[PDB]
Design an enzyme around this catalytic site. Sequence first.
Site, PDB file in Angstrom:
ATOM      1  N   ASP A  96       0.908  -1.129   0.000  1.00 44.06           N
ATOM      2  CA  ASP A  96       0.000   0.000   0.000  1.00 44.06           C
ATOM      3  C   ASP A  96       0.971   1.208   0.000  1.00 44.06           C
ATOM      4  O   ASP A  96       2.191   1.019   0.063  1.00 44.06           O
ATOM      5  CB  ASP A  96      -0.845  -0.004   1.278  1.00 44.06           C
ATOM      6  CG  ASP A  96      -1.981   0.995   1.223  1.00 44.06           C
ATOM      7  OD1 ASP A  96      -2.021   1.765   0.238  1.00 44.06           O
ATOM      8  OD2 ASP A  96      -2.832   1.013   2.161  1.00 44.06           O
ATOM      9  N   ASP A 118       0.032   5.177   1.198  1.00 39.41           N
ATOM     10  CA  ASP A 118      -0.246   6.085   2.302  1.00 39.41           C
ATOM     11  C   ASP A 118      -0.132   5.390   3.655  1.00 39.41           C
ATOM     12  O   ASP A 118      -0.740   4.341   3.887  1.00 39.41           O
ATOM     13  CB  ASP A 118      -1.654   6.696   2.189  1.00 39.41           C
ATOM     14  CG  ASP A 118      -1.816   7.607   0.974  1.00 39.41           C
ATOM     15  OD1 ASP A 118      -0.996   8.540   0.796  1.00 39.41           O
ATOM     16  OD2 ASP A 118      -2.781   7.399   0.203  1.00 39.41           O
TER      17      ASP A 118
END
Lengths: 291, 291
Positions: free
Chosen positions: B43, B45
């Site tokens: 991922d 963020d």
Amino acid sequence: AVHLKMMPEFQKSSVRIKNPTRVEEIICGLIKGGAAKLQIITDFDMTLSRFSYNGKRCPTCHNIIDNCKLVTDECRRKLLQLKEQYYAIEVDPVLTVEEKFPYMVEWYTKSHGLLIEQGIPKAKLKEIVADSDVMLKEGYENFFGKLQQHGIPVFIFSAGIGDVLEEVIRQAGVYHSNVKVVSNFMDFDENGVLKGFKGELIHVFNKHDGALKNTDYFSQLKDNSNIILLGDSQGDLRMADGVANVEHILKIGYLNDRVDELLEKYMDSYDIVLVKEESLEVVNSILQKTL
Amino acid sequence: AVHLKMMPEFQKSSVRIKNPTRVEEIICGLIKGGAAKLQIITDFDMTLSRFSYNGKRCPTCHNIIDNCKLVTDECRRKLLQLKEQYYAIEVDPVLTVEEKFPYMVEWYTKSHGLLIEQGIPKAKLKEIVADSDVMLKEGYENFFGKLQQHGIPVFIFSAGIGDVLEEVIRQAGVYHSNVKVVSNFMDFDENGVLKGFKGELIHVFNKHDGALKNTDYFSQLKDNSNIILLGDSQGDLRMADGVANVEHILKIGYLNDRVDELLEKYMDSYDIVLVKEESLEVVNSILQKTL
């Protein structure tokens, strides 16, 4: 605006231009478009790599494997006869290009086979390239760096060995996300050792055929209608026969060999010719006015 | 053999492992696979970016836009307000992932669509990110560096904003060829103006979908059966779905918000948990051994 008489890069005697008012114009449209419309199509060997250094002859990717500590002296020799005998077909002034296609296939299929025989494993490619004598043309930093800066798609389309080409640029620290490489890649075995090559044999003359099988990649870059083509051969002139939409295109070509041989040809086909040169500063300058 | 007792990184006060023996064999599974069999799926963020800095919780892809200078404090109020609402649901212990689901879409539809009302010029996203306060976790130039030099594939699967993400990593100089980004990419109009978003939305709860909608990439990597997965939420555990066959897979999850509330939820689903942490040394140390 733009003017070649005022660009210090276009004043060296190794820069020939038949239609100068053609170049300036194309470059101006390249400015109107800036980054958003920019696209670059490039060959690798002798174009992004050096043809010569310290007066000495530099290697092509295939050569990095020809001069590595894993191939035999009888291979180099057997490989040498190959070139000696086939280069003559490549540079045959009478036969037309099409009447050569079958040859290249034999040339490669016969030159790779000797490598497929030498048992060369992926593992040593990073080590081997780690010390070879290859060199990226002067300014290789300004080039790849300005392009990645403005997300300018770079399509390196080479008749060399993809794995070697990818290890070279990776070590020069320029193999950024914006760089797409399409070449003859290795189809290794179980022990990480070479055993063959993937797909159709891309060679110096079928760029027309190779380019079309990538229209895919091209229609996806519809907004990048302005392209600069860097090549060192007539064949590289077809490297772009598959671009989606074209507004402007500049054909920059390196003539590093047989200089007093094909100059008129180059002035005709390419817009700009770089006679015996090891720097990308020229193209790096066109990018300066453009980005 | 692998022993976490000795790897210092596994001794920091930000490492909570339910069962280390299970964690030690998996890692040991990674090590027996080597480079050629490894790929990264992460991922972005709060995973490759920081949760907080100097005291103020670092921004996410969207946050960089939200607070941009091209977004009115009015645009921010409607945006910030549009967050103080659904988030209450986004983290509503009552509802379930099935229900919270339709909610997210609305939030993303309301957020982007608002940004669309500001007329964001692609050409300016550089300056915007160039002055933002985004922070990549500690030890990243190396994280991206070891991986690029080994040619390891990296699949960044983000529910943030595509273009912004690309600019953050580009400016940090780590957006190498091995990095593949799949996110919510924005679309522009005539003069490059934010109008809509490409493809199918990616939100915090359905990465399984996007994971499947990427066959070409994974099919081309069906051989890389060893995977290290990095995320900040439960939803990220699905990011490895489009993965054909898996020999060894290690999942590592960061917990940066609601520590006491979710701590146990992350330990029962993430082999290795990194509680309130802004560094990647636990993963970089695994790469140092594996490669």
